[PDB]
Amino acid sequence: NATFRDASSRRLAAATGVALAEFLQQFNGLAVFTKNTNIRTGIIGTNPRLMLGKIRKWAQDNV
Amino acid sequence: DTSGPATIAGNSTINLRDDFIVEFNMKKERYRDRKGGETPFFSYYDYESIRDRLFNSMI
Numbered sequence A: 001n002a003t004f005r006d007a008s009s010r011r012l013a014a015a016t017g018v019a020l021a022e023f024l025q026q027f028n029g030l031a032v033f034t035k036n037t038n039i040r041t042g043i044i045g046t047n048p049r050l051m052l053g054k055i056r057k058w059a060q061d062n063v
Numbered sequence B: 001d002t003s004g005p006a007t008i009a010g011n012s013t014i015n016l017r018d019d020f021i022v023e024f025n026m027k028k029e030r031y032r033d034r035k036g037g038e039t040p041f042f043s044y045y046d047y048e049s050i051r052d053r054l055f056n057s058m059i
Helices: A007-024 A048-062 B048-058
Strands: none
Touching: A007 A048
16 A cells, blocks of 8 residues: 555645645535425525535546 | 416426406496487497506506
8 A cells, every 4th residue: 555655645635634624614504405405596505416516526626 | 377487396487377357247327318218228338447447456
């Protein structure tokens, strides 16, 4: 296993952790329709699928 | 009835249209001229006043 071999890898992992944290910070104080996901017009809401979407988007960006 | 799109999907601007009818039952009143004459029951009836007042109220 060679992922965490170079110290640089470790430091990069830290830099990515803090960035991911500050990113996820946007997902605070909103709804999470998780049974009948039909988020109504004019409400600040989301569902797990849209979350996964945005996460994958961020990830694929920072590549 | 509908007015275009009507699919029920929680967000599609369900448009609707109801057709209703308003009927006046008014009594026709013949005119008499003393000289022994009358107006038939089939004479013209001034509805224009009725449409006018109904439309003013609606406006």
